Ligand binder design. Structure first.
Ligand code: MG
Ligand code: MG
Ligand code: MG
Ligand code: MG
Lengths: 443, 443
């Protein structure tokens, strides 16, 4: 109980907020909210706010249903970019049915249910540290994004320098002032691409931090006359954007992935988690990469994980184990992209990993032979397998796998497949300028 | 023997040709030629012309190999649009290895081999009548195609009218003057789309007529300041272009598909051919639709065949049997598009149909229930199956089927597979403006 009702009332009185955003996330990952005056703060705290519940279902909404908007007190945050005409505050809200039951279609409720399963299994918390990457594009005269980048930087380069602008520095400063924990920020290898690293907190707080980070980055980029994009592959021939998850499992004693007497300073729980992640990776590749553009990033190379393997020496595997040990022991999954929904992503990941522990699966031997060059026979000889190359194959894998369905729940599962198949069918029937430019003259 | 060497020499002397195009077709269907003066007509007739044989292999050429260019006398044609500075003539040429053997990679030689198999099986000829459809686009200031059509016509509409222009009428008149047999021409349902129907001749002559028709249509359009396109789906939301094949099998007695005492006035040979076509349709869908844009035309509707069924009453099936009987009895395949290679198309079709006759397969019962609306269970209850929805699945079906491989030969099979896989990989890794407009601002 970080905050209480009286604390929220006192904060609203003493920083004098007049606008409150009760925000939530739908299946597609779009940040949605209802906006109320500060005079209705009491009604929000009393959990009596109605809203059109079909909104969270996305564009496939059919039947309107009124449902509650139970908020969370620990997520009270006041934005500074509010001028003098009243402050603005946001609160992450749970979705509840009118019968005082959490909605099955709410990703946050699904993540809470999966975390409850973890806790009743024997663990305490599921820490996550994400490393999102975003692109910045110069706006046009009509406040429209262009295809030109703000600077021609490089990997870890000091590209934006100083003396005003430097949107990454301003974003980091605003996030720090607002009350977020930032480890480090740098320039990614692609021009105009930046990465900001976060500390390690709980899974739900990790989702809240990710969503708030997306909102803040978009707002600050817009205010500086730029456009912030989290699409994985904005341009061809340019490196994509990733959101690598550094995740660790904790118990009553402490870190469950650390053991000084084990191989690689890893506990058997860590190996079971690795086996669970590797076995079902093809299953949840769709959840971790929900957009068509996402699979354009997953191409064979030296930085895009398109194989199913784990390593700790050669790096660039599907799952990488950082050299740090002790309380910082963790397993990194590099196939996640910023367009993914964090709630569903760690829901399916936790389920897969925990199933690997329940089944006590033995992970395959790590590969440190730089798996990009070996022949197809060599890859087939080892347990190396490729991730799905398109959204449709990933959707088929989802429809085949059953554990990921349980981790996602029912309602979320059917809604996700429905919306994704519509997006896939829309992409399939479209005619692109590539086909015209390479067949109009030839044929 | 329609023509002899002396006849060719006399023609060259009396219409005074000075430019000769020894033209041939590669695997991809692109019309290629070598151009020689009339003084070298003797060397061409002596079958002593060398050329870089790796050209017919396409862009996947690796090793240069010199090989002969044995021409065909029956295809001597003189173009009229040659002004006064000498006429131009073309001759379809077979590809021969330096050891006096036909090249395995020549589509025409493969078709000749398949026809030899047919003849030794007991049949005489394989008549074909194609119905190609093409689009006309207005050129820009820099002689570049635009996205605007020449007229907003309709199905069978009298759109181009008269008083000059009317590129379809001029094309038909030039083709008739040149010595081709034209049944009828009309305006297709899409704006700016025209269809010209041909008579029924032998398969090799059908290929020659199709290639000459493509060349003539392109040339006349260019002269009239327009661009002729055979790409199946130039625009989204606009009907595609088809090249329906009306094919019949002949024997010593006459038409092998006609029998007054049989059901539907059809012989058992016709039913065996139908069964062979239906069984392997998924196999040769790739050959009949060799481009990525081709499968954008094969979408569920009322005019695009995306199902595997035959009918003669409801129309719009995969294979339609026209009501005409007697010597005009024929089976129409509607899945072919103008971008396909006619040689490979009828090679695989003849093989499939003849295999159905050899195996005496019984075709499934025809469906006249307008197969667009019945539920998926209803379609599954009947032997209705869908054609491959993408080029990759069609390539997989080709790699699985063995009869189509025999019909294509070895060299053609591997070269086609390599080229199509390269093209599919290029399409897969590209980033299209659709993705940007759908995820850039959203994510
Ligand atoms: Mg990075
Ligand atoms: Mg990382
Ligand atoms: Mg037609
Ligand atoms: Mg037709």
């Amino acid at each position: 109980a970080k905050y209480t009702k009286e604390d929220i009332f006192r904060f609203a009185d003493e920083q004098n907020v007049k606008f409150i955003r009760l925000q939530f996330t739908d299946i597609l990952g779009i940040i949605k909210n209802v906006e109320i005056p500060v005079s209705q703060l009491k009604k929000a705290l009393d959990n009596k706010i109605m809203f059109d519940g079909s909104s969270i279902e996305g564009f496939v909404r059919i039947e309107e249903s009124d449902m509650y908007l139970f908020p969370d007190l620990d997520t009270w945050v006041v934005f500074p970019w509010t001028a003098e005409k009243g402050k603005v505050a946001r609160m992450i809200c749970d979705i509840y049915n009118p019968d005082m039951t959490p909605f099955a279609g709410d990703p946050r409720a699904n993540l809470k249910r999966v975390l409850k399963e973890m806790e009743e299994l024997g663990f305490t918390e599921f820490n996550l540290g994400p490393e999102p990457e975003f692109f910045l594009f110069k706006l046009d005269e009509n406040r429209r994004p262009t295809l030109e980048l703000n600077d021609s930087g490089g990997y870890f380069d000091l590209a934006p320098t100083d003396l005003g602008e430097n949107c990454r520095r301003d974003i980091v400063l605003e996030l720090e002032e607002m009350g977020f924990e930032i480890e480090a920020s740098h320039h990614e290898v692609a021009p105009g691409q930046h990465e900001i690293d976060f500390k390690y907190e709980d899974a739900i707080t990790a989702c809240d931090s990710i969503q708030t980070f997306k909102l803040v980055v978009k707002t600050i980029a817009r205010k500086h006359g730029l456009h912030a994009t989290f699409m994985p592959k904005p341009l061809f021939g340019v490196n994509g954007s990733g959101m690598h998850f550094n995740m660790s499992l904790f118990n009553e004693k402490g870190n469950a992935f650390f053991d000084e007497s084990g191989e690689l300073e890893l506990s058997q729980t860590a190996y079971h988690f690795l086996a669970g992640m590797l076995k079902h990776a093809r299953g949840y590749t769709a959840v971790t990469n929900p957009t068509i553009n996402s699979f354009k990033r997953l191409v064979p190379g030296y930085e895009a994980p398109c194989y199913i393997a784990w390593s700790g020496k050669n790096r660039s595997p599907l799952v990488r184990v950082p050299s740090s040990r002790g309380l910082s022991t963790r397993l990194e999954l590099r196939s996640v992209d910023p367009s993914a929904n964090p709630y569903l992503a760690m829901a399916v990941l936790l389920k897969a990993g925990l199933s690997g522990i329940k089944d006590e699966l033995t992970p395959p031997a790590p590969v440190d032979r730089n798996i990009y060059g070996m022949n197809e026979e060599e890859r087939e000889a080892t347990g190396i397998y490729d991730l799905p190359e398109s959204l449709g194959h990933a959707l088929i894998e989802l429809e085949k796998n059953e554990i990921i369905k349980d981790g996602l729940g029912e309602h979320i599962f059917e809604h996700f497949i429905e919306a994704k198949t519509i997006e896939c069918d829309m992409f399939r029937t479209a005619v692109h300028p590539w086909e015209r430019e390479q067949y109009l003259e030839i044929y």
